[PDB]
Amino acid sequence: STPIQQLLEHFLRQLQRKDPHGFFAFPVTDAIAPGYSMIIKHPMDFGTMKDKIVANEYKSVTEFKADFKLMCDNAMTYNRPDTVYYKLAKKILHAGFKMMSKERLLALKRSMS
Numbered sequence: 001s002t003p004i005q006q007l008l009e010h011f012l013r014q015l016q017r018k019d020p021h022g023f024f025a026f027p028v029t030d031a032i033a034p035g036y037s038m039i040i041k042h043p044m045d046f047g048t049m050k051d052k053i054v055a056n057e058y059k060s061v062t063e064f065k066a067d068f069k070l071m072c073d074n075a076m077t078y079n080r081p082d083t084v085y086y087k088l089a090k091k092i093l094h095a096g097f098k099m100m101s102k103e104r105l106l107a108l109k110r111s112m113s
Ligand SMILES: COc1cc(-c2cc(C)c(=O)n(C)c2)cc(OC)c1CN1CC(O)C1
Pocket: 021, 022, 023, 024, 025, 026, 027, 028, 032, 033, 074, 075, 078, 079, 085
């Protein structure tokens, strides 16, 4: 395992503990959500992101943040605002971007000197 992999696994774990029922743990299927694929063209989930970290598919924290935003955006695009999925996606989005903020990544960048 590499330093970037270790850092991405930490961010992922801290994000995964916000989803207790595992609604974002594995991909959304047409069986679980009717006509999902007709609406969501670029699907994403925590499990897909885990495989990518392991496969060393992330060159930056930005690439990781982009797949995380994608996951939350898809849940807010498919589901209406009064649903449990939309509300959880909104909360985990705000949580991930506070945790992976410019101020936090800057403090980290400066600690690598
Ligand atoms: C992958 O797992 C599920 C994902 C969803 C889900 C549905 C929509 C529409 C949606 O946008 N997102 C993001 C997730 C719903 C599920 O069923 C209640 C499950 C089943 N699992 C949950 C565990 O408790 C059983």
